Design a protein around this ligand. Structure first.
Ligand SMILES: *[C@H](O)[C@H](C[C@@H]1CCNC1=O)NC(=O)[C@H](CC1CC1)NC(=O)[C@@H](NC(=O)OCc1ccccc1)C1CC1
Ligand SMILES: *[C@H](O)[C@H](C[C@@H]1CCNC1=O)NC(=O)[C@H](CC1CC1)NC(=O)[C@@H](NC(=O)OCc1ccccc1)C1CC1
Lengths: 306, 306
């Protein structure tokens, strides 16, 4: 019993983190096989931030401009290319700690662990989610760029996120490992806005099931509802529409608890309508939307990895 | 910026987790040098669980009764002994991935990362605190016993917690690595209760400082108070007393924000007397007490470890 915001164990990712320095810019890189991936804005200067032609700046550069510390063993760069917003540094040493891995591009609503790093060294690990407006609510300081987000499926690390930038609401934006931003953002210090976020309804329902599995039942009711009538209330409260696809992912959790999905929808509806009136659910006084249905099953069945 | 419950990177601990089986009991062990530490109730049967004399049971045992598996590698047990509520299994192979480590016993209100494990394999990592009633609010299922809690000290793992039991309430209880329970609990399935908990006042205050450092100031005020009159209010709302030592640990955060500790205390008092009135702080609608002052500084200055 118990339910926590739980990250994947970070060991397999820690053994890939390196430091990349070019000019007076230091950030993090990801070293897989003989390749080091990092944000291309490592090749900028502090005045270049306003409107760089990264294509300008890369041909400017020679392999020897790139300093690639793995620990205090310095890695010789022997080639470089740019893929969208990531820079790929070919080095003369394959990473012996390379895990088995994939590059995946995730969908809004999905979650992943972030291993926050500075100067190639890990600082901490936390979950978060790709928000519907394609930002993430992370914890990043100067120097964190190149930190990555990932999921583990038994032995395989699926990398989904590399950090690039903080927007002026304190939320963060970045790319997949092929260098394409999530959302409309660009690696440029000109005014950009996140866009209004919304709540991940299917995740909120999964968390309500986590609650029931762990003994919070004070929010349930006999009420039932239809997908469409529930969806009328979702609009009103800035909640993502629920699809039949979503209902179907929630089946397993529905069956384990014996609570129909639309009955849980009726519970959520009364929760938005009436608020919580002092009570908490799983230690929270807000409805939590950063656990997927898989995160809930993962944790409430103790799935492991190696 | 941003603020999350961030765990320590778990790599150094993952390389010490092993599986310990004896009879029909499998749980986790911690393998450091040539010693495997695990809960002594691995030697019990599903009927010993009631009121065992572990001395009874351990004399009954032979080295070959313990199956200790490090991945798929059979570790041979060559010696055993019991220290309070932990078993120490002497094995013929020293763990080549043993880190710099210490065994520490923490105080209530201190935090640590937990690496939850099943069958010797990591399942996830999360942060929590030693509650004032010496329980932890964890996430643990059957088979998780022997999972450990730890802090990192640049390069040194300080182990503080090993998991043993879940109380009714769904909170958890365990030992330090020398086998002494936190709190008055015992490793037998006789009726036991946690004891009323209280809020870690010093931790709520540094979390309010984390909020200010990150741009939530809606709760701040003109007012100040005396440590004596604040503590009159902390009593009324089931908060731990604030000591002058606590005021002193909050100095650094106080100086960075320029808000006196006693000004922040006046702010918390109005929060307690009025509530939050629909507003959130750092994404929470409750006052959060599982960040220490050190947790806030490391995160809001990006301390790294190796
Ligand atoms: C990389 O280490 C770093 C991480 C940032 C720094 C602080 N928190 C983080 O997550 N990223 C950057 O410094 C990038 C570099 C730019 C991408 C090439 N910049 C930013 O994160 C800046 N944000 C920004 O310019 O947003 C656009 C904007 C929005 C409003 C008004 C003007 C511009 C943050 C320093 C501001
Ligand atoms: C070890 O893997 C396991 C972990 C537990 C099981 C589920 N959640 C967990 O964290 N620990 C146990 O099974 C231990 C074994 C006891 C230490 C020798 N027991 C418990 O966790 C049980 N709790 C318990 O006996 O508490 C005392 C009590 C309280 C009320 C009434 C009677 C007894 C939980 C299985 C019940």
């Amino acid at each position: 019993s118990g339910f926590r915001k739980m990250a994947f164990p970070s060991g397999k990712v820690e053994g890939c983190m390196v430091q990349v320095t070019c000019g007076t810019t230091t950030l993090n890189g990801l070293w897989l096989d003989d390749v080091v991936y990092c944000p291309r804005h490592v090749i900028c200067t502090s005045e270049d931030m306003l409107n760089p032609n990264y294509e300008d700046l890369l041909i400017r550069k020679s392999n020897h401009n790139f300093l690639v510390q793995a620990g205090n063993v310095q890695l010789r760069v022997i080639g470089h290319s740019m893929q969208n917003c990531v820079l790929k540094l070919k080095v003369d040493t394959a990473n012996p700690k390379t895990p088995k891995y994939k590059f995946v591009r995730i969908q809004p609503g999905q979650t992943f662990s972030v291993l926050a790093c500075y100067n190639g060294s890990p600082s901490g690990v936390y979950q978060c989610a790709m928000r519907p407006n394609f930002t993430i609510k992370g914890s990043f300081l100067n120097g964190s760029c190149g930190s990555v987000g990932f999921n583990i499926d038994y032995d395989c690390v699926s990398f989904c996120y590399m950090h690039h930038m903080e927007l002026p609401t304190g939320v963060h934006a970045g790319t997949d490992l092929e260098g394409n931003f999530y959302g409309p953002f660009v690696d440029r210090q000109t005014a950009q806005a996140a866009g209004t976020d919304t709540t991940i309804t299917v995740n909120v329902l999964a968390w309500l099931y986590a609650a029931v599995i762990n003994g919070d039942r004070w929010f349930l009711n006999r009420f039932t509802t239809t997908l469409n009538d529930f969806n009328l209330v979702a609009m009103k409260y800035n909640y993502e529409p629920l699809t039949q696809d979503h209902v179907d992912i929630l089946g397993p959790l529905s069956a384990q608890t014996g609570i129909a999905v639309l009955d849980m929808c009726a519970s959520l509806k009364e929760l938005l309508q009436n608020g919580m009136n002092g009570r908490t659910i799983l230690g929270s006084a807000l409805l939590e939307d950063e656990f997927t249905p898989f995160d809930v099953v993962r944790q409430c069945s103790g799935v492991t990895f190696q």
